Design a binder for this molecule. Structure first.
Ligand code: HEC
Ligand code: HEC
Ligand code: HEC
Ligand code: HEC
Ligand code: HEC
Ligand code: HEC
Ligand code: HEC
Ligand code: HEC
Ligand code: HEC
Ligand code: HEC
Ligand code: HEC
Ligand SMILES: [Ca+2]
Ligand SMILES: [Ca+2]
Ligand SMILES: [Ca+2]
Lengths: 521, 521, 521
């Protein structure tokens, strides 16, 4: 009763390769969950040659048929079709019952049939997420301050332990092949690959073949189901409260309420997604990634993208302020002047002379630590060629207009623009609140309540009042901006929003007051 | 596959007005999501004259047929039937392809066919939610302290920005029509209304025609689906942790666990809701709003209400204590003596002389700040005519008994009463904990750790220790009472309950101790 | 439309006892929800004699047929079959329309047909949960510190009030029969039992007949549905953030994401659960309790257990450190040496002389407060017979291997072992962080920032810095271990994980610094 007879289901398949038939004949008994899951995939039932017969909008392969290897064109995508691809390019290739297979199927393997998707992904911030985090000295200092501590002379935590179960679970690990292990399994002797850093399915996973990304985030193996990729649950693996509460905001939004109750009557599987005809409430994919087509006119409302950056005009994740979206996905290459001298001079006139040590310093961040007091403007990062690191105003306006075109499937244009204008005001206000907590932190360093040493960036984030400052942007300003962008309510208020942000400001002020009272006493 | 062919669905409709046929012929291509959503509504398929043929219990119209305008009686409720209603009464009425339409359809428009529902709603605290919050000087001070701050001489945040994305998202904004904007849309020149304060769908939204409320909270447009109104998700737009965690409490409750797994076999659509026959686990609507009828006897278990106040005997939301429910929905009209003189004298004998300044002061709150030390009783608010502002004991007992009658569909009476008695003990205990944190706050003001000035109520809520006091009632006492009332577990404990409340008390005590140590040093 | 006609459904039943027919004829009108719910149970449609005809793997009765009372063998399990069982053994037995019935049906009643399940449960930590919590003087002190306070000389909170709505809601209450109440109900005079401590359905509920447990946790009455028992929602009644966030961790895990979207195509009802054939993503029951059978080979992958302890090798809930699983469910019988003298001497050499008072002291905990500084090892508890209280290394390895066998239905063995190794590193690291906060607490007591008196254990947990210490293990270390074990992401990081733990350490250090600054001033 919903029970799948696995043997009968395998026997009814067609266009299975002789190789895959061998894998299945064994794996159906040793890993029945994998076989059942694979049986649910569109890939188990469609050959590349068949997919290429479909009209462009409906088709979900993108490597031209004549560029797909001949032995793959006329069989469904089975165990051998993925795991046996390009053995010589995979360091985790092992002999396995007469076949040369590798366990970690990578974006470069996917690209054999989905070239366009991999090309798009590889340019994205997601693909570069490990380097964006771990090869940025400032961000890595935050990683370190958050996941390491000392106990009686020794340091605990680090990349392969505390960081692997935390930051790198979402951002991605570096996978290293370190050997093999001989096991006995269901009576059979089997050699398995020994890894460091796998299992891991973070978006910027660094694979053994050097490609970047895990293509099983969003649509997990082995079902590879776009119905899952278009659900909110799948993005909720990584987009949660307190730092990146897109799932929580959406769940409380009316879009979310309606989707939970009505999605049973939506068509979640049509490759060209049709607003109205297929769904009446948007999910993450609807606004961020999906191909959207007008059900009556056939007009493309939005082209599919596997580079999510291309839809965003303003980065709501504060670093430390919200800022125009970076032009490329390699954020670790950004460099900005940290502190304008006119602002530093104004700070020093009020007794905060610490800002002086930041004049002329470059930081690997998209935006400066303070605006210029004369102009009222922040400084924006450049790339190593000296070109602007963030998108132009014209590009922001184009992206904003494309998003409004999506809303316009279900709302009038002024309605959508009104919300985007409100979002601008919240970007402005949260950025000012973040500047305020930043100045309070400079006071903490000036008065000796906290210690700082720029040659050792972990010292920016390693004490309690410094963590309060971090939360002001990383948790509260972010939540307010997210909640405004995606129609939240409590995430902009008591849970993680304005109330928390204003509380945090006062919390910092109280600590400073107690410290001064303890000194001047 | 669940895909709706919109053109075919429109063509199969019957009793559509000539006007609406014109709207549809265009809107099917320009806003396909709205048309699909409207197609799912009961209103797209039933005329007022047809609804009036149904038996009283089954019927979901309430304005007598002969009082519904003749041109509306024999057509389904389409785009023109709502948006073209009473043009002269709506300031947002604009010419629109030959029709006089207004975008914001208001409770007064709904009342054309649903008079009883609007009459009920208009008396409720929900309808008055903007005024209850924003026109109460004390509560508005809390709004202000939570959503505004100063940075280098300037104030940031306010009604149209930080407050609009936060408090007013749930409570409601004031909608102002400020002009129009000429746009080009799908090649067509179209003039749209320019608003301040819309989009917004908070319960007390102040509409352009002066009516109060958004009738798309709970059952959103354009499906207007009671299956959504009876889901927990819809109330979860606004009833969330930390301040009003009814959704979170219910989700963890056994009622919630069972509903999540069994509701696929419930009839969520029958207008007269039948316990047992239609559902075996209650949602928010079941206990708070729904018409409930015994499936075997036909006895009405509970009459439907759109004034949720009528079912509540005790306000669990502390202001600052839990108190008997107000008699009317206009809470901003309540006035109470703040501090009994016998209590103030007792406070002053222990060195807390601040309470003296509250003797004879009236506050716009339902209950006094402290009980009378002689009698042990709180003082309750009056209304401007001097009559009691809160319901009588006899009325509380009636409401309590009506709720128990609902539980009795699925439980014995003593079982339900036992829980309501437990709730009374938690009201008593949380109120005492709130009195304790209030006295700690008086100590903070007395010792100079915090500043207060009653002529400027924002100063009640603008510092860290004051926000700790706020949380003791607004978050923790509330959560404990909610969790007890609706069968929570962790919301009464570690998440937001007893543990947090006792921690908060000690947190305040520690701050006071540190402050005194820094002084007497 | 999903509406059940209750009268017709009752009339279609077969093998109903004459007694139950009498109960139904009345209860269908007075408690329609209970009758509808019971109608959905497998027990309403199967007799014990019929269940015994089924093959062993499929069968869900376990008391041998010839040991089930003859009058129960050939009727379905109706109202009288449960509520009329063994009247003389139940103190809440009352006369009720000619029948001798008791409202609280207990594990001993269930055992009449499900002997094996009750035998298993009765040995488990769950069955003993009230005593584990309330009869442990240290844990009871934590209960007290968290749910009681004083206001002007009087104590508020306690077992029948604050604790009943909090800790005891999950752990269980002690049910006392205290009398009866005469009510009028639907016109009928009816006497009901008056209880203290019921309603309650915590796992260790102490029933009126002296048996331990509530068999309606996990699979609630009256549907008693294993589809509910195997859902995540049901365990989420009690396994939530911040202390025991298994539900929250699972929800964010890929297992959870997939289950939410695919479970509509799973067979959630087959008594012998088949990975792959019946489901492709695991729930709580899958890994913790269920009978799992290979769909192709028929091999038992895991035997069903109602003693969840039997599957666990290491207790992730810190007391105060993570430790090997106790051998028996009676945790209140454990006793450990608290402080090794070599460690105390090392502490005293650094000025923390308080540890001296713990040398030779036994605490009712599974593990010592600090490791021995010489050996680097913790001390483990013994039982009253002096035998080891925690499982052997050999037993841990067996349990670990059994769990890996479950994962192996859907993953290779090295993949699963890799995660369990990562879990070991997190146990090690979180335990060291917990030792660090414990030493900070000893500094707080030494410096006079906090007060302690071992003769009065509530003083361990009654002040703010002490509660910060509690959270370091009870919330943060626990969440990190849970998230690692069950594939969380944000629960190991910003929500309740590494970031919070390192923040807590620094929060304690800041308080100590402020205190010292206020003294040396
Ligand atoms: C051929 C040898 C393939 C390679 C290797 C991979 N994919 Fe594939 N994929 C292939 C076909 C022929 C199809 C059917 C296309 C059609 O138009 O019918 C697909 C489909 C997908 C999908 C869509 C699934 C859905 O539910 O609609 C996805 C998400 C997908 N493929 C992803 C994917 C990944 C992640 C791959 C490597 C791990 C991968 N594909 C490899 C052909 C082939
Ligand atoms: C039995 C004769 C097998 C056939 C033929 C194939 N597979 Fe296999 N595989 C088998 C076992 C018993 C195991 C280990 C199970 C366990 O519990 O550990 C595996 C493992 C794999 C893996 C993972 C290997 C690793 O190093 O991690 C993969 C990716 C895999 N199997 C796929 C696969 C393919 C592609 C096959 C044919 C080309 C194939 N298997 C055949 C048993 C047998
Ligand atoms: C429109 C109805 C949305 C749906 C539903 C969801 N997202 Fe969204 N998102 C939307 C907008 C208009 C914006 C602002 C765009 C910009 O340029 O800033 C966002 C923003 C995000 C972000 C922030 C990215 C950043 O700039 O730092 C994230 C991470 C995000 N959205 C993800 C996301 C998720 C996980 C969603 C469902 C749970 C989701 N979005 C839904 C529009 C909409
Ligand atoms: C009441 C039963 C409605 C009928 C039938 C239709 N609409 Fe509607 N519409 C209604 C309300 C109550 C509101 C907003 C006020 C609120 O409290 O929700 C609206 C709004 C619109 C809008 C503007 C908002 C937006 O999302 O852009 C449009 C463009 C709109 N309605 C169009 C529309 C069409 C095409 C309709 C029939 C298919 C239609 N409305 C019917 C209430 C009602
Ligand atoms: C006639 C011109 C209408 C006005 C304007 C509005 N409503 Fe209506 N509504 C109308 C009819 C004839 C019916 C069908 C009643 C029946 O017994 O069949 C309804 C129904 C509803 C419902 C019930 C929907 C359900 O799923 O059961 C709701 C919740 C509802 N109507 C709300 C509503 C609102 C919010 C309106 C203005 C925005 C509104 N109605 C206007 C007739 C008319
Ligand atoms: C084309 C000739 C139209 C017909 C006839 C009607 N509508 Fe319309 N409408 C149309 C467009 C292109 C737009 C704007 C879309 C966008 O993306 O901005 C609208 C807008 C509305 C609105 C909102 C107006 C506002 O000021 O916010 C409403 C409420 C609306 N339309 C409803 C409506 C009704 C009730 C109509 C007939 C009486 C009707 N529309 C006709 C296109 C056209
Ligand atoms: C009974 C099984 C309930 C269901 C399910 C839900 N609610 Fe409830 N609620 C119930 C009772 C018996 C009470 C106490 C009544 C009183 O007089 O206080 C409540 C209380 C609330 C409140 C508090 C209102 C106040 O007094 O301040 C709210 C806001 C509320 N209930 C809303 C609500 C929501 C959003 C629910 C599901 C998520 C919900 N209730 C379910 C009974 C029951
Ligand atoms: C066991 C398989 C049951 C049978 C069959 C029925 N009931 Fe039951 N009932 C059962 C338990 C285990 C409990 C409470 C103890 C617990 O741990 O859950 C109850 C309780 C009741 C009550 C009182 C509680 C309440 O909600 O009011 C009533 C009034 C009740 N049961 C009635 C009842 C009827 C009408 C039954 C058949 C339709 C019935 N019970 C069957 C266990 C079992
Ligand atoms: C009417 C003549 C009845 C028949 C015969 C039986 N039950 Fe009953 N029961 C009836 C009423 C009106 C009530 C109280 C309802 C209320 O709202 O309070 C009950 C109560 C119970 C209970 C709970 C009793 C308690 O002390 O808490 C149980 C467990 C119960 N009923 C079960 C039951 C059984 C097992 C019966 C036949 C053996 C039976 N009921 C008959 C009405 C009537
Ligand atoms: C595997 C895919 C899991 C599923 C899904 C869930 N649980 Fe789990 N759990 C799993 C493992 C491998 C472990 C560690 C085992 C050990 O010996 O420690 C756990 C641990 C728990 C615990 C901690 C018990 C303790 O040691 O203190 C709890 C309370 C728990 N699991 C419950 C639980 C719940 C409520 C789940 C779904 C929400 C759940 N588990 C899913 C494996 C898996
Ligand atoms: C791509 C479309 C796949 C095909 C078809 C199959 N597998 Fe796969 N497999 C794939 C990926 C992308 C990965 C891991 C890397 C990632 O980013 O997710 C795997 C992994 C495995 C493993 C090892 C991991 C584990 O859970 O143990 C095994 C044992 C495995 N795959 C076996 C397997 C079988 C039996 C397949 C057909 C039934 C099969 N794979 C097909 C991608 C793809
Ligand atoms: Ca520092
Ligand atoms: Ca103040
Ligand atoms: Ca103490």
């Amino acid at each position: 009763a919903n029970t799948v007879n696995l043997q009968e289901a395998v026997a009814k398949l067609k266009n299975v390769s002789p190789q895959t038939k061998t894998c299945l004949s064994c794996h159906i008994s040793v890993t029945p969950g994998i076989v059942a899951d694979w049986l649910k995939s569109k890939m188990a039932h469609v050959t590349p040659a068949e997919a290429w017969q479909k009209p462009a909008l409906e088709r979900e392969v993108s490597t031209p048929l004549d560029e797909i290897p001949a032995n793959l064109r006329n069989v469904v995508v089975g165990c051998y079709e993925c795991h046996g691809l390009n053995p010589e390019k995979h360091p985790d290739t092992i002999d396995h019952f007469g076949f040369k297979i590798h366990p970690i199927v990578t974006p470069n393997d996917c690209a054999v049939c989905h070239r366009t998707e991999v090309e798009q992904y590889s340019k994205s911030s997601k693909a570069w997420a490990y380097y964006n985090l771990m090869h940025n000295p400032i961000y890595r200092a935050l990683v370190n301050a958050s996941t390491m501590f000392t106990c009686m002379g020794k340091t605990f935590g680090g990349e392969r332990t505390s960081q692997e179960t935390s930051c790198l679970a979402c951002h991605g690990t570096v996978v290293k092949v370190v050997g093999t292990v001989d096991t006995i399994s269901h009576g059979i002797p089997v050699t398995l690959v020994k890894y460091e850093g796998y299992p891991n399915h973070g978006v910027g996973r660094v694979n053994p073949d050097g490609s970047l990304g895990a293509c099983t985030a969003c649509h997990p193996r082995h079902s590879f189901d776009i119905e899952i990729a278009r659900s909110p649950y799948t993005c909720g693996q990584c987009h949660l409260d307190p730092d990146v509460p897109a799932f929580n905001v959406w769940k409380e939004s009316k879009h979310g309420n309606i989707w939970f109750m009505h999605h049973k009557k939506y068509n979640m599987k049509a490759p060209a997604w049709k607003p109205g005809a297929d769904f009446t409430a948007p999910t993450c994919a609807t606004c961020h990634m999906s191909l959207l087509v007008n059900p009556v006119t056939g007009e493309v409302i939005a082209e599919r993208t596997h580079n999510v950056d291309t839809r965003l005009w303003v980065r709501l994740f504060g670093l430390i302020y919200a800022h125009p979206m970076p032009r490329t996905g390699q954020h670790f290459k950004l460099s900005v002047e940290a502190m304008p001298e006119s602002t530093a001079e104004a700070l020093a006139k009020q007794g905060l002379t610490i800002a002086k040590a930041l004049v002329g310093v470059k930081l690997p961040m998209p935006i400066s630590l303070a605006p210029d007091i004369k102009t009222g403007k922040f400084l924006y990062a450049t790339l190593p060629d000296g070109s602007p690191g963030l998108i132009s105003e014209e590009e922001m306006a184009k992206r904003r207009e494309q998003m409004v075109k999506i809303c316009s499937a279900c709302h009038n244009t002024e309605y959508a623009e009104y919300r985007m204008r409100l979002l601008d005001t919240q970007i402005e206000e949260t950025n000012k609140a973040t500047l305020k907590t930043t100045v309070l932190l400079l006071k903490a360093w000036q008065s000796g309540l906290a210690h700082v040493d720029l040659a050792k960036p972990v010292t920016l984030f390693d004490e309690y009042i410094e963590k309060l400052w971090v939360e002001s942007w990383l948790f509260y300003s972010n939540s307010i901006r997210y909640g405004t962008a995606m129609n939240g309510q409590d995430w902009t208020t008591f849970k993680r929003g304005w109330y928390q942000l204003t509380k945090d400001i006062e919390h910092m002020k109280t600590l400073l007051r107690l410290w001064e009272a303890a000194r001047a006493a």
